[PDB]
Paper text:
Human ABC transporters ABCD1–3 are all localized on the peroxisomal membrane and participate in the β-oxidation of fatty acyl-CoAs, but they differ from each other in substrate specificity. The transport of branched-chain fatty acids from cytosol to peroxisome is specifically driven by ABCD3, dysfunction of which causes severe liver diseases such as hepatosplenomegaly. The overall structure exhibits a two-fold symmetric homodimer, with each subunit containing a nucleotide-binding domain (NBD) and a transmembrane domain (TMD). The helices TM4 and TM5 from one TMD are swapped to the opposite TMD, i.e., domain swapping, which is a typical feature of type-IV ABC transporters.
The phytanoyl-CoA-bound structure of ABCD3 was solved with the addition of 0.5 mM phytanoyl-CoA during sample preparation. The phytanoyl-CoA-bound ABCD3 adopts an inward-facing conformation open to cytosol, similar to the apo and substrate-bound structures of ABCD1. During structural refinement, we observed two symmetric cryo-EM densities in the TMDs that could be unambiguously fitted with two phytanoyl-CoA molecules. Unlike our previously reported substrate-bound ABCD1 structure in which each C22:0-CoA molecule crosslinks two TMDs21, each phytanoyl-CoA molecule solely binds to one TMD. Specifically, the adenine ring of the 3′-phospho-ADP moiety is stabilized by Glu111 from TM2′ (TM2 from the other subunit) via a hydrogen bond, in addition to the π–π interaction between Tyr330 from TM5 and the adenine ring. The 3′-phosphophate group of the ribose forms a hydrogen bond with the main chain of Thr326 from TM5, and the β-phosphophate of the diphosphate forms a salt bridge with Lys322 from TM5. The branched chain fatty acid tail forms hydrophobic interactions with Val215 from TM3, in addition to Ile374 and Val375 from TM6. Site-directed mutagenesis combined with ATPase activity assays indicated that the chABCD3 variants with single mutation of the substrate-binding residues (E111A, K322A, Y330A), supplying either the polar or non-polar interaction with CoA, displayed significantly decreased substrate-stimulated ATPase activity, compared to the WT.
Author numbering:
A (entry chain B), B (entry chain A): 60 to 406, 428 to 647
The structure:
């Protein structure tokens, strides 16, 4: 994985912006507590064998002297190991916040929550990539920082310490054995992941014959069915997935061999290397004039060799985890590339859109879907603020395609388009959109709260806007202007359309779409809404099947879904 | 959980039927290798400290004497340790097979795969209750057998051995400290699972505001959208789920306290109790007149106290796992009771069904849906073998209720019914049912090839049956009478209906239902099928919307869907 490091650097520069920040501060703090954690671990090794030497030296003075050193130093030892884990966890959180604040300026920039989900197919689940995969990526880049550099400082320190303690060949025949036996064991157990997938395949298709029996049992039951679908499930279970007995038999024999040359013969090698200074009376540098320092020197060397040996089991596992980290940075870099692709207008684009006021002419503009299939050839019409348009047709596949192009939600396949910008086009579907929040932020949704007051507005004006739609009892009944509850369930039917009309009245757009929305609204207040929009100047694009709504539309556009149209 | 043991006993008698079987044999073998594993663990404790005493006694004779004992005994130690794991795994598999061969005799008895699915509501997913929860239950009843009795034999053995080695108060002040400090730690860390759910709630609703943004982005993008839905997700993240920082701060302080009184102060207590025979120079029974055998006695007592202390951490965890085992035996006993309930008929039954030949009369019998509704007040008609019946109506909700009652798939809501038993009623839906297996078994499905010969039939006759349906080229195209690949994909169209008609011809039932099946079959083939059925005498209950198919039905039944019928 050569490009994995190159891709990981780009993400790292996002999560470590400058050289003076808390993330840089935590990185130094963890590195300081990684070094000081190894010293505390060695100090326990040296002090621990001095409590034990004083116990069996039968001196109460030596036992008290070295037990009190342990008691005095354990508040500091516990501080080091536990403030290192605090620094790791805080770095995981700081990394996640740094990435999220970068993956959400690109995501929610112009229309990218929409284009990346319902206009391209690069990412199947956008949501799972911005909340779930971001958390696991950050939890693995500092996990690899710790799990790789923690059992590496002591590897260097124990090799440096076991040398000049059991000789240079001491922690080298242990390295040779742990590596040679590790490679041989891994090669020997090759058919473990080979028959793990076979078990998973047999498990996966044992649930299939069960699910196929249930979601299809209607026909199996009329004619008897059982005793034939019973032997189908039985054969998949009794015959197919009972290699577990062959899998269990292999794991027993493999376990019998890997528990000898990696668990008991590894210690036999450990005894041999450590015992060289002791079973050699002509050893000048080390023990030659020692009486009970032989005891402390052995268990210091014996405990160091055990920690040096078991640090490889954690540096090997850390390298294995790097493959998972390589998988995560692939999806993050894929998501980052996709977000940067759509932010420039990529996923088409030949046509030009020029922002104009009260001009919506579609002069020589096709109606191609984002794939490219043109369904309307020669759209050419203009309407002005003051004349309504009724859209007619059997709603096949083109009714909900002119609006998407109109709102710039879909690409323009050539031609010149004039229309107001995003803030003036309004679309009201059959079920209106209710916002997660209070009752006040359902009338003023696309506007915020702080910038709502600067428009010279008041809650009384919000009430009278909401009163014009024949809805004044909900405000008092629900709990007030700041009552927070789910408005998709606590509201059902006409009141949603009434609140949508109230929002439209409050915002006062230039053009509005009423696609099969006014279906549970009284006809008198419907005419009132039409008159209000006409007198204030809210042009409406009415889509309806009711024949009585044909008196407030100066123009009329019809789509057949076959290729032609009349205006 | 008093009844949990009572329920677990009933399941155990299923998986341990008699006192002479493999499960009894494995249970004794595991118990034998559980006792002999503790002896091998103690023998390593005693032998291990004799290699170390020989090393630092600087005698090569003692090092070789006790290293060769370790080398000679390590094939047997590994054999004992890995034959226990083999016995556990084999018991897990033998338990799963014993339960499955009991949960599938009750499941596939008469219509219970069908009744439990869409006639009861006790189990929502019966599929993941006979393959997935059965495996995890058996994997936990013997995991509890090992994980509870393994760190209990050594608990008794180490207490018996540490006593008379460091005195009776030795492994009692350690029991007192571990139990008392364990309770204090658990009580102190009460607000860990209390704020774990708060994090999960905040995590779960951070994914909600993301998913609600995606599955609803169509209307959001038509407004300006962002800067209002951007601050909704931001507030759920930046404000709400940063209790992690308060969760991280608590875990640092809580960890700082539990790493002192349970990790470093536990050893300080361990030093104090073990050291009593040594610093007491007047200890008469123990090492009063000994050489430096205090070395071997200390580390034998020191290693035993560490294994005795750490055997409690596994007996505590074993008890915690019992709660999960209590959950599993609830679903297994719930499934077992539902299986036994339906085998007699429960979920109704007022009417009586008496088997007969060629008569399907419905004198004074309603067609009630097995819920609290009735769609036909009283059906009353009879047909004779040889007279086809056409069923009319726009198949709303009553057409697919006469057939279910006819096949005994639904209960009889009073009245007297005469009809042939399960093997003679036939129902062919719009898409026929194809069976996992060869091409031969798609013609003879509810029969087996083993019982296919007892009818005096041959593959030539099967081909002849396949010839009458105007479909004979598929046999030699797919690979013969043994082509295995699934037939819901290779066949797409009228071939499935042709094979269903071939199966109908082969089985020669008394009555058959042709509910909207013949929709991709040429009219000549329809006439041939009807003529062949009339000649042989297979009465047909035809459901069709074609007016031309009205000349070969002596009778005619009409379900208007209002509550009455026309026969
Ligand atoms: C500073 C400079 C001067 C020099 C700097 C140079 C440095 C940086 C070099 C850096 C090298 C690294 C970076 C290179 C890595 C490349 C490699 C990763 C790639 C592969 O392709 S490689 C694939 C498999 N590679 C394995 O590496 C798995 C095996 N990894 C294991 O870690 C063990 O195999 C296991 C833990 C499973 C062993 O089993 P454990 O029992 O679990 O550990 P152990 O058996 O090895 O112990 C050892 C022994 O110490 C002795 N000992 C203990 N206590 C004693 C006592 N009281 N008295 C006397 N002796 C004692 C024994 O008695 C015995 O102790 P026990 O542990 O058995 O009790
Ligand atoms: C046979 C008859 C005569 C009598 C039969 C009677 C029997 C059956 C009675 C049966 C009792 C049972 C059934 C009742 C259970 C009821 C209970 C479950 C209900 C609760 O409501 S209870 C809720 C929490 N209950 C805990 O129980 C958690 C804490 N459970 C732990 O298990 C550990 O706490 C942990 C694993 C965290 C170990 O803690 P750790 O600190 O991580 O290890 P450790 O330190 O404790 O080991 C101990 C020390 O031995 C000394 N020792 C070691 N090496 C030495 C050396 N070389 N020299 C000298 N001394 C040494 C130390 O120095 C040191 O070990 P080292 O740290 O030195 O290595």
């Amino acid at each position: 994985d050569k490009v994995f490091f190159s891709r990981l650097i780009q993400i790292l520069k996002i999560m470590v912006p400058r050289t003076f920040c808390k993330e840089t501060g935590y990185l130094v703090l963890i590195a300081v507590m990684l070094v000081s954690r190894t010293y505390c671990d060695v100090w326990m090794i040296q002090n621990g064998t001095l409590i034990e030497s004083g116990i069996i030296g039968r001196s109460r003075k030596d036992f008290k002297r070295y037990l009190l050193n342990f008691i005095a130093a354990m508040p500091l030892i516990s501080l080091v190991n536990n403030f290192l884990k605090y620094g790791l966890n805080e770095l995981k959180l700081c990394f996640r916040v740094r990435l999220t604040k970068y993956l959400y300026e690109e995501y929610l920039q112009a229309f990218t929550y929409y284009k990346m989900g319902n206009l391209d197919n690069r990412i199947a689940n956008p949501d799972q990539l911005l909340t779930q995969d971001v958390e696991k990526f950050c939890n693995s880049v500092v996990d690899l920082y710790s799990n790789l550099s923690k059992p590496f400082l002591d590897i260097v320190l124990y090799i440096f310490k076991l040398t000049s303690a059991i000789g240079a060949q001491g922690p080298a025949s242990m390295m040779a054995y742990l590596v040679v036996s590790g490679l041989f064991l891994t090669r020997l157990r090759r058919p473990i992941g080979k028959m793990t997938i076979t078990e998973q395949k047999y498990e996966g298709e044992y649930r299939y014959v069960n699910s196929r029996l249930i979601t299809n049992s209607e026909e199996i039951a009329f004619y008897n069915g059982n005793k034939r679908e019973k032997q189908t499930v039985h054969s998949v279970f009794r015959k197919l997935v009972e290699h577990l007995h062959n899998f269990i038999l292999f794991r027993f024999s493999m376990g019998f061999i890997d528990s000898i040359i990696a668990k008991y013969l590894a210690t036999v090698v450990g005894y041999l290397v450590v015992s060289r200074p002791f079973l050699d009376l002509s050893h000048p540098r080390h023990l030659k004039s020692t009486h009970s320092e032989l005891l402390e020197d052995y268990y210091q060397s014996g405990r160091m060799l055990l920690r040096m040996s078991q640090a490889l089991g954690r540096i090997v596992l850390a390298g294995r985890e790097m493959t998972r980290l390589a998988g995560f940075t692939a999806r993050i870099t894929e998501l980052m590339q996709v977000l940067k692709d759509l932010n420039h207008g990529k996923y088409p684009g030949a046509g030009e859109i020029i922002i104009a006021d009260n001009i919506i002419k579609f002069d020589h503009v096709p109606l191609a879907t984002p794939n490219g299939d043109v369904l309307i050839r020669d759209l050419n019409f203009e309407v002005r603020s003051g004349a309504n348009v009724l859209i007619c047709g059997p709603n096949g596949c083109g009714k909900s395609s002119l609006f998407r192009v109109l709102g710039e939600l879909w690409p323009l396949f050539g031609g010149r388009l004039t229309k107001p910008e995003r803030g003036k086009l309004f679309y009201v579907p059959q079920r209106p959109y209710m916002t997660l929040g209070t009752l006040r932020d359902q009338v003023i949704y696309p506007d915020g709260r702080e910038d709502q007051k600067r428009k010279g507005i008041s809650d009384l004006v919000l009430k009278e806007y909401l009163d014009n739609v024949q809805l004044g009892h909900i405000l008092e009944r629900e709990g007030g202007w700041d009552s927070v509850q789910d408005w998709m369930d606590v509201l059902s039917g006409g009141e949603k359309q009434r609140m949508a009309m109230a929002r439209l009245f409050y915002h006062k757009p230039q053009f509005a779409i009423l696609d099969e929305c006014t279906s549970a609204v009284s006809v008198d207040v419907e005419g009132y809404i039409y008159s209000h929009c006409r007198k204030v100047g809210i042009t409406l694009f009415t889509v309806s099947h009711r024949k009585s709504l044909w008196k407030h539309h100066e123009y009329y556009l019809h789509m057949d879904g076959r290729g032609n149209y009349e205006f």
